[PDB]
Symmetry: C3
């Protein structure tokens, strides 16, 4: 489906992916014109597995391309490739300008 629940104007696409696929996902997202990915280091299972959380907040009508493009850049075929979560976002505000909603 595409009418995600809860309904929202904006969504966070949160990807937990391999650390070495950072640029591959970033580049692929650039090829569809989406900029402004935020990246942070996380770890799954003192034994851990190093992962990278990639966040980008987008309009509802962009979510499917983003998902597909992250998969494209993140998939290696092996177990440990990660997951992608789609979370509703009520509002986006640009700090510099104070612009809310679509103007942000």
């Amino acid at each position: 489906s595409s009418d995600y629940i809860p309904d929202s104007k904006f969504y966070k696409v949160e990807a937990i992916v391999r650390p070495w696929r950072i640029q591959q996902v970033s580049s692929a997202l650039l090829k569809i014109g989406i900029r402004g990915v935020t990246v942070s280091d996380v770890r799954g299972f003192d034994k851990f597995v190093a992962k990278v959380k990639m966040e980008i907040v987008v309009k509802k009508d962009q979510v499917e391309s983003v998902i597909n493009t992250i998969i494209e850049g993140a998939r290696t075929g092996e177990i440990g490739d990660g997951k992608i979560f789609v979370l509703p976002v009520s509002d986006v505000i640009r700090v510099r300008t104070g612009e809310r909603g679509e103007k942000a």
Copy 2:
């Protein structure tokens, strides 16, 4: 209540807990059959003075939420100020990178 607003198929459970309680929360969740926990380092400023905490993140179905909450409390509670908080956030969809499977699949 169990009917959380906003209503969703999945929910993210976010636990900000003491760093030395990582293994205990991880294992307690393991005993109820839950894996896929991811952890990151956070700093609580609530000089450059902070308290070191860890954020523990898991995404589960709506019917798993209460079991996850209680199991994190069990793994993380010491009884002293600074045990942390748990946040429950709606998640619209979950997608496995390797396979493309969405929803419950």
Copy 3:
């Protein structure tokens, strides 16, 4: 706000040197417990910090404003603020949920 919720997470992706200003400004409006982490923007990266705070619905506007005050420089790269609905808040120590759990009760 859509979706409607009792609580909202306010995530602020801002400059690393703006922690104290954002922090202090929030304390003046009665928000004591901000959570901070290292994040990177776009091998070259831009260093930023994610500041996370969960508040009641009626506090969100005031929290957006206060963060802007502490974080705005006027320069390109001031960051963005995201508002996400939070279904429930639980205090680990006591098991308290809802309003009797939102306030940060740690030492200063």
